[PDB]
């Protein structure tokens, strides 16, 4: 599915997100998942209060994520057709 591949493509860039917790996190993204796990660095948190903090490394659970906010160049990225028997989108030379 495409909504997951877009995420994997923003690895490296800086990302903003929102959790069920209520707080938003901002930082460089290192790894993601099909679950919607994340692995980030140099995070700058900002809760409901406005309280800023620093977190060196973080892992997440996707279940806990509400929504992400992604860089602007990631709208020209390709959105593929996928297929019935494939996990990752990718381009497809073969039959279909």
């Amino acid at each position: 599915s495409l909504c997951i591949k877009l995420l994997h493509e923003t690895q490296g860039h800086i990302v903003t997100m929102e959790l069920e917790n209520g707080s938003t996190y901002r930082g460089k993204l290192i790894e993601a998942e099909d679950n919607m796990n994340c692995q980030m660095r140099d995070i700058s948190v900002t809760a409901r209060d406005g309280r800023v903090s620093h977190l060196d490394q973080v892992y997440i659970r996707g279940s806990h994520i509400r929504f992400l906010i992604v860089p602007d160049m990631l709208r020209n990225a390709p959105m593929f057709k996928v297929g019935p028997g494939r996990s990752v989108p990718l381009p497809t030379r073969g039959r279909r």
């Binding site: 490296g12 860039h13 160049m73 020209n76 990225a77 390709p78 381009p91």
Partner: protein, 49 residues
Amino acid sequence: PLSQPIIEPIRHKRIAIETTNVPDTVYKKEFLFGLLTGTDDVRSFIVAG
């Protein structure tokens, strides 16, 4: 001498294949510049053997 025409014929000297126009390809061209300009997605290398 005879060989040399007199009215020169037009002659397009071509060495190698090239496409008159860009060939259309899946990923859009701006997104290729996006990568090339924006980030560390880019790599480079030499294929050898």
